[PDB]
Point group: D2
Chain length 106, copies 4
């Protein structure tokens, strides 16, 4: 998928996790979010099309996806230990990473 399809995957599943009921629903949305972050890691955002692929802005862009993957990694370990409430609550951590990247690059 392109970067916008990955953003739509992240937006949708972040909501499937706010409104979540059962466990394998939080587990499955975090898995789809991790797939979308990893897939998006290599993309160039439109605001940076004109920049060197190894410009400080593209280095910082890719770093935001490392932070988000690190957060989905911990939340999925919480969800897989039966701590499903604490995994939902990890949403508030994620949104903050969503907003930091959007502030500079969307």
């Amino acid at each position: 998928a392109d970067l916008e399809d990955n953003m739509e995957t992240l937006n949708d599943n972040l909501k499937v996790i706010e409104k979540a009921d059962n466990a394998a629903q939080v587990k499955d949305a975090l898995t789809k979010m991790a797939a979308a972050a990893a897939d998006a890691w290599s993309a160039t955002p439109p605001k940076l099309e004109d920049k060197s692929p190894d410009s400080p802005e593209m280095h910082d862009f890719r770093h935001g996806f490392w932070i988000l993957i690190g957060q989905i990694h911990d939340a999925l370990h919480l969800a897989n230990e039966g701590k499903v409430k604490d995994a939902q609550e990890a949403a508030e951590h994620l949104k903050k990473t969503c907003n930091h990247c959007h502030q500079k690059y969307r």
Copy 2:
């Protein structure tokens, strides 16, 4: 130090980071925060004085400090990389971790 003392070190140095005007003030405040979080790791908070050292509650409490130490680790790399504004902005990430432990265990 006791948990109350470590928290005041966290609170003070987080204020230093938000208001800092040079790179050395941010690095130094991040190192002091890491020392306080590491020291707090061993503490039993008041609401859990009755629970055992290896209870689920005390397991989950200590996990909160690993998250915080993880964030300070990343912010200090940003700071030692020249990316000092980005290190300052990691303060917004830390507060979420501060609030989350407070909501559950304070």
Copy 3:
């Protein structure tokens, strides 16, 4: 790219890191490794072609790539910090992750 291609990118760039003589060769090889690990994240390896996408086996396989991405993240911060020899030495950490996945899933 396919899993075989991503592995050859991992193998080649790991060799570049061990034999590199300037900072730019280490950074560039670490970024290429991160791109290949992120791309490999989606793959199904041969020994697990019969297992489902959300099987325990495929969960554990993907976890191996999070570990590797985590290590490359840390090594690149060491490299962008001036600590280039320490970034080169992180290669010894990566190989352990390479061997561990190979022992279980290759």
Copy 4:
């Protein structure tokens, strides 16, 4: 405890984890190792007594304890998801961090 008492705690429990049988035995040794790493984070090793507390050697010293705490964090999530074999095997990851610090500072 001082730095040598923490090293003896890490050495002992790393062995309790090679020879481990049950689960709460691997869980309890990883917990004691995490306590010892956090406690040791603030110490000054004898080889660096003569160095600035914020010298590159003391910064790199404390960084080794971040890496080890990060590894114990992941292994304890593996042990707490019933993946007790994969948690034992995390020993090989840890030993490599033991050796890197010892190479420069013990």
